[PDB]
Amino acid sequence: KNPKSDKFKVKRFHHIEFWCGDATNVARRFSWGLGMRFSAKSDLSTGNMVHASYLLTSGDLRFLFTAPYSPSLSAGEIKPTTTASIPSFDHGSCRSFFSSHGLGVRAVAIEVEDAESAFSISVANGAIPSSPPIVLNEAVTIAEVKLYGDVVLRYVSYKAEFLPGFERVEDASSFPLDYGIRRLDHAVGNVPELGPALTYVAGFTGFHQFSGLNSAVLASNDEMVLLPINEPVHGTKRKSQIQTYLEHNEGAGLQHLALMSEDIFRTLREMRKRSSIGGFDFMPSPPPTYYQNLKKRVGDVLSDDQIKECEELGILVDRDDQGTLLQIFTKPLGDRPTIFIEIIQRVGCMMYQSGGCGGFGKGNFSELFKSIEEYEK
Amino acid sequence: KNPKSDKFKVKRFHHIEFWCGDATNVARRFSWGLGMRFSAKSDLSTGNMVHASYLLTSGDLRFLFTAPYSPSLSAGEIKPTTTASIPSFDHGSCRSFFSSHGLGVRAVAIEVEDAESAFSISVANGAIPSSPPIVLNEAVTIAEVKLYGDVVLRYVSYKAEFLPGFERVEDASSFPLDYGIRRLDHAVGNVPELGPALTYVAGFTGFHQFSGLNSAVLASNDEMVLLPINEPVHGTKRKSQIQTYLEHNEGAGLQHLALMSEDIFRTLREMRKRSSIGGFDFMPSPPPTYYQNLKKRVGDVLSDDQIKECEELGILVDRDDQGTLLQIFTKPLGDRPTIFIEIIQRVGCMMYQSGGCGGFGKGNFSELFKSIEEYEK
Ligand SMILES: Cc1c(Cl)ccc(C(=O)C2=C(O)C(=O)N(C3CC3)[C@@H]2C)c1Cl
Numbered sequence: 129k130n131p132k133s134d135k136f137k138v139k140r141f142h143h144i145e146f147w148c149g150d151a152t153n154v155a156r157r158f159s160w161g162l163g164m165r166f167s168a169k170s171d172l173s174t175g176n177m178v179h180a181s182y183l184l185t186s187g188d189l190r191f192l193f194t195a196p197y198s199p200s201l202s203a204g205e206i207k208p209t210t211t212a213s214i215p216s217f218d219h220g221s222c223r224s225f226f227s228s229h230g231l232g233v234r235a236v237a238i239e240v241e242d243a244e245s246a247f248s249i250s251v252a253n254g255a256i257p258s259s260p261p262i263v264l265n266e267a268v269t270i271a272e273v274k275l276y277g278d279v280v281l282r283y284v285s286y287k288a289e290f291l292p293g294f295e296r297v298e299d300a301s302s303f304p305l306d307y308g309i310r311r312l313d314h315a316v317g318n319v320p321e322l323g324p325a326l327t328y329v330a331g332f333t334g335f336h337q338f339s340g341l342n343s344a345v346l347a348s349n350d351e352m353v354l355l356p357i358n359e360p361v362h363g364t365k366r367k368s369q370i371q372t373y374l375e376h377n378e379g380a381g382l383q384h385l386a387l388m389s390e391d392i393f394r395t396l397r398e399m400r401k402r403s404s405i406g407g408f409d410f411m412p413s414p415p416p417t418y419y420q421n422l423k424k425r426v427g428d429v430l431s432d433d434q435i436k437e438c439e440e441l442g443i444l445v446d447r448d449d450q451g452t453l454l455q456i457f458t459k460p461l462g463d464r465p466t467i468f469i470e471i472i473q474r475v476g477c478m479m480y481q482s483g484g485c486g487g488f489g490k491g492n493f494s495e496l497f498k499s500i501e502e503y504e505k
Numbered sequence: 506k507n508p509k510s511d512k513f514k515v516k517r518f519h520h521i522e523f524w525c526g527d528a529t530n531v532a533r534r535f536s537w538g539l540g541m542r543f544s545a546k547s548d549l550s551t552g553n554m555v556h557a558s559y560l561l562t563s564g565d566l567r568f569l570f571t572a573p574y575s576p577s578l579s580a581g582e583i584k585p586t587t588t589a590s591i592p593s594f595d596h597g598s599c600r601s602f603f604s605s606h607g608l609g610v611r612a613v614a615i616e617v618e619d620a621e622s623a624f625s626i627s628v629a630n631g632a633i634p635s636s637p638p639i640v641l642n643e644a645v646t647i648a649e650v651k652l653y654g655d656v657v658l659r660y661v662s663y664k665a666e667f668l669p670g671f672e673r674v675e676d677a678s679s680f681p682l683d684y685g686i687r688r689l690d691h692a693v694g695n696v697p698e699l700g701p702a703l704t705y706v707a708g709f710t711g712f713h714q715f716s717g718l719n720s721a722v723l724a725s726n727d728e729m730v731l732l733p734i735n736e737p738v739h740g741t742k743r744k745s746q747i748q749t750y751l752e753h754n755e756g757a758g759l760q761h762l763a764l765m766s767e768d769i770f771r772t773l774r775e776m777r778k779r780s781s782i783g784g785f786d787f788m789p790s791p792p793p794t795y796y797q798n799l800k801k802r803v804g805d806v807l808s809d810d811q812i813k814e815c816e817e818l819g820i821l822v823d824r825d826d827q828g829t830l831l832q833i834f835t836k837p838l839g840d841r842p843t844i845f846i847e848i849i850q851r852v853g854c855m856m857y858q859s860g861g862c863g864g865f866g867k868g869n870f871s872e873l874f875k876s877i878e879e880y881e882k
Pocket residue numbers: 314316343344345356357384386457470488489490492493496
């Protein structure tokens with residue numbers, strides 16, 4: 129059931145912004161690890177005396193990496209005279225965020241029809257304002273409300289190239305890496321209490337509802353903006369990974385980003401080639417029994433060769449009543465056991481493909497448990 | 506003239522420690538960019554609840570990358586019960602350093618015969634103590650004094666593998682990258698006033714003395730520990746890069762690290778291959794006239810082919826009365842126009858090769874000026 133109750137017109141995920149201590153080194157690591165091209169910058173070389181911001185792109189996926197300069201470079205400026213390209217940026221907020229949480233997502237940005245209306249309607253419906261709507265070069269409007277923890281939901285709307293004040297990067301610096309990643313599929317938050325988090329976010333957006341944790345997914349009208357939220361389940365034998373996250377992150381925050389690949393086998397071949405030379409590591413592969421048991425579960429979707437390819441790369445597979453899900457998880461992206469990345473490809477639900485086709489892989493919890501147990505053998 | 510006036514026995518450069526906001530992403534970027542292997546770690550997986558520290562090595566060169574965890578993970582500990590592997594580490598000092606200076610070198614570490622004696626003698630001769638000598642697992646002694654700005658000179662001595670509490674890394678994670686870099690040749694500081702900086706450092710070590718700036722080099726007895734220091738020259742047409750450094754760094758600090766290569770042509774081929782895919786960029790190449798003029802200056806040292814190889818890679822060449830110097834500079838390593846890296850190879854002064862053979866390239870200032878002028882043509 130989809131009531132289509134969005135309180136304002138939402139289009140697609142637009143970008144994800146990481147707050148960093150040094151944007152250069154994080155961006156370069158991510159570019160090589162994920163096969164994303166450098167495509168825009170806003171920094172000293174573009175007149176920005178406030179923050180260094182570098183944009184990576186792969187297909188429609190946009191990762192922004194931002195770090196503060198010394199406040200002294202901009203101590204003469206005031207907000208009317210600011211050289212910052214992202215007016216919501218604040219030196220103190222950024223340093224407080226990174227010292228508290230370490231490297232992580234500050235903003236989940238969605239493109240909307242009218243960012244000022246989205247902000248006003250959100251706040252009228254309980255959203256905690258973070259940064260009021262600001263019109264950038266009479267062309268782009270940006271506004272921010274609190275989502276969970278110190279993560280904001282960022283609204284962006286365009287009258288008619290990332291943001292004003294960002295320059296496209298020189299093609300010499302812009303090497304066309306591409307491992308097949310094409311768009312953000314979902315962005316997941318960890319909170320202490322799921323109920324109040326859902327009530328808050330669904331309250332101001334109108335988004336509808338789509339071991340160790342309880343979870344639920346909020347979705348926009350066409351279910352292309354997908355925001356799962358997790359809470360820990362206390363008192364289990366194995367301590368909840370959600371609780372470990374909250375402890376190491378100093379509270380609620382973004383847990384994982386799911387990136388859709390147009391060819392998950394190629395993406396994982398390419399990423400795994402680079403794991404030990406600057407890229408990303410992957411969680412331990414499931415035991416061979418998991419792949420033995422995949423014939424009975426998805427034998428009608430993937431051939432024996434395609435499932436063998438999954439076993440090589442450590443891919444996981446799940447299936448709902450509508451489609452099939454291929455997925456795999458990186459180790460944490462930084463020092464702390466907090467944020468990680470999921471690579472995903474979905475099969476089925478063709479009308480274009482409908483959002484969330486195949487679910488989010490919750491069947492893989494019991495199947496992995498069963499798998500290791502019967503693997504022990 | 507070399508008075509050999511060291512006030513304590515100094516061996517070689519031991520390691521350079523960067524203070525980071527996220528050690529993982531910086532270390533992985535540096536590993537790929539410079540061809541250095543991951544060889545030791547101290548972090549949550551080794552029982553360290555205080556800081557994440559990752560060691561990269563290439564030949565004898567050791568780069569350490571350290572970032573703080575949430576203080577809450579170790580809030581129950583006291584210094585006697587600390588899980589930190591580097592006892593001088595302090596959460597507050599580290600966060601203050603990175604917010605003030607951004608990514609940069611916290612410690613220039615030299616190996617000495619007796620770190621406690623070096624500390625005591627240094628402090629008796631004017632050194633400002635930073636961290637008193639601590640004996641680690643009855644095996645290694647570590648102590649720190651202020652060098653300049655918030656950079657410390659770190660003494661390490663071994664009774665008889667990096668530091669106790671560091672684990673060698675699993676060979677799967679340890680990919681044997683190597684672009685030919687073999688050791689640290691010199692480490693350079695920028696200060697506001699050269700005179701008082703020299704008087705201070707030469708005062709407590711006994712080290713002897715070996716446009717836009719004035720500079721001087723302090724050296725140990727065998728001139729294998731080499732510490733150049735720069736000050737800005739004010740009032741020139743083109744603003745001093747030393748002054749720009751001081752402004753963007755919020756004061757004195759480490760300007761560049763010079764890394765000796767056993768084959769600078771191979772190192773630069775390998776690094777330049779990776780510039781646009783996660784590695785390091787290099788400063789703009791000198792004009793062809795510079796390479797035209799190299800026949801008259803070093804035609805007896807490098808063949809026409811070897812000088813052509815220099816022109817391809819943008820290498821610079823200088824020469825004193827004792828040897829020849831091949832050098833090239835990266836763009837800044839991080840967001841701010843502060844720290845960069847020099848790659849170097851020295852030819853001549855064979856006895857082993859004596860330290861500083863060929864100087865530090867100060868002849869390249871006037872030669873580059875002349876070169877661009879006569880290039881304009
Ligand atoms: C480690 C692991 C496995 Cl074994 C399987 C799926 C995912 C995953 O991506 C999740 C989401 O996107 C979501 O909404 N989830 C809820 C349970 C519905 C899961 C947590 C993860 Cl992290």
